[PDB]
């Protein structure tokens, strides 16, 4: 069901190394809907290559546009399993401190703060 269940640890490590080789300026991001989520739709894919200069505030705007949300729909994003302390941090800095041992950066979205 989840990305980690679909691909082996060895397969996930190797896909991050291929992104380092072929898209060296991109952050490898896994974005998944909270398994309780009723209101928000699913994304068209799971694995995203994010330009390393964008901050978390801009990534939230990108994901709202990808999901085709309207102005009043609530959206909450966890990174590495927890709330973001700040949305102003460049994703290169977020990646270095919150990356998974496989080298992906894991995000989960819900319509409620209570995941
Ligand atoms: C951490 N060790 C490695 C080993 N081989 C690699 C090949 C391509 C890109 C990154 C790589 N990193
Ligand atoms: Cl690149």
Swiss-Prot record:
Localization annotation: Cytoplasmic vesicle, Autophagosome membrane; Endomembrane system; Mitochondrion membrane; Cytoplasm, Cytoskeleton
Topology within the bilayer: Lipid-anchor
Transmembrane stretches, start-end: none
Entry-linked Gene3D superfamilies: Phosphatidylinositol 3-kinase Catalytic Subunit, Chain A, domain 1 (3.10.20.90)
Summary of the tissues where the protein is detected: Most abundant in heart, brain, skeletal muscle and testis. Little expression observed in liver.
Pfam families membership: ATG8
GO MF terms held by the record: ceramide binding; microtubule binding; phosphatidylethanolamine binding; ubiquitin protein ligase binding
GO terms under biological process: autophagosome assembly; autophagosome maturation; autophagy; cellular response to nitrogen starvation; cellular response to starvation; macroautophagy; mitophagy
Ranges in coiled-coil conformation: none
Alphabetized UniProt keyword annotations: Autophagy, Cytoplasm, Cytoplasmic vesicle, Cytoskeleton, Lipoprotein, Membrane, Microtubule, Mitochondrion, Phosphoprotein, Ubl conjugation, Ubl conjugation pathway
Mutagenesis / variant outcome for changing residue 48 to A: Decreases C18 ceramide binding
PTM remark: The precursor molecule is cleaved by ATG4 (ATG4A, ATG4B, ATG4C or ATG4D) to expose the glycine at the C-terminus and form the cytosolic form, LC3-I. The processed form is then activated by APG7L/ATG7, transferred to ATG3 and conjugated to phosphatidylethanolamine (PE) phospholipid to form the membrane-bound form, LC3-II. During non-canonical autophagy, the processed form is conjugated to phosphatidylserine (PS) phospholipid. ATG4 proteins also mediate the delipidation of PE-conjugated forms. (Microbial infection) The Legionella effector RavZ is a deconjugating enzyme that hydrolyzes the amide bond between the C-terminal glycine residue and an adjacent aromatic residue in ATG8 proteins conjugated to phosphatidylethanolamine (PE), producing an ATG8 protein that is resistant to reconjugation by the host machinery due to the cleavage of the reactive C-terminal glycine. RavZ is also able to mediate delipidation of ATG8 proteins conjugated to phosphatidylserine (PS).
Primary location group: membrane
Outcome following mutation: residue 64 to A: Impairs cleavage by ATG4B
InterPro entries in the cross-refs: Atg8-like, Ubiquitin-like_domsf
Domain of life per record: Eukaryota
Keyword Metal-binding: no
GO CC terms: autophagosome; autophagosome membrane; axoneme; cytoplasmic vesicle; cytosol; endomembrane system; microtubule; mitochondrial membrane
Effect of residue 66 to A: Abolishes interaction with TECPR2
Family: Belongs to the ATG8 family.
Quaternary structure (record): 3 different light chains, LC1 (a cleavage product of MAP1B), LC2 (a cleavage product of MAP1A) and LC3 (produced by one of the MAP1LC3 genes), can associate with the MAP1A or MAP1B heavy chains. Interacts at microtubules with CABP1 (via EF-hands 1 and 2) but not with calmodulin. Interacts with FYCO1 (via C-terminus). Interacts with TP53INP1 and TP53INP2. Interacts with TBC1D25. Directly interacts with SQSTM1; this interaction leads to MAP1LC3B recruitment to inclusion bodies containing polyubiquitinated protein aggregates and to inclusion body degradation by autophagy.
Role according to the record: Ubiquitin-like modifier involved in formation of autophagosomal vacuoles (autophagosomes). Plays a role in mitophagy which contributes to regulate mitochondrial quantity and quality by eliminating the mitochondria to a basal level to fulfill cellular energy requirements and preventing excess ROS production.
Protein name, UniProt field: Microtubule-associated protein 1 light chain 3 beta
Organism: Homo sapiens
């Amino acid at each position: 069901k989840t990305f980690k269940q679909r691909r082996t640890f060895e397969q996930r490590v190797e896909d991050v190394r291929l992104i380092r080789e072929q898209h060296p300026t991109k952050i490898p991001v896994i974005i998944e809907r909270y398994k309780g989520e009723k209101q928000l739709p699913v994304l068209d894919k799971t694995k995203f290559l994010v330009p390393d200069h964008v901050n978390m505030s801009e990534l939230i705007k990108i994901i709202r546009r990808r999901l085709q949300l309207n102005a009043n729909q609530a959206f909450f994003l966890l990174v590495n399993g927890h709330s973001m302390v700040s949305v102003s941090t460049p994703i290169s800095e977020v990646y270095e401190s919150e990356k998974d041992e496989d080298g992906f950066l894991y995000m989960v979205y819900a319509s409620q703060e209570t995941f």
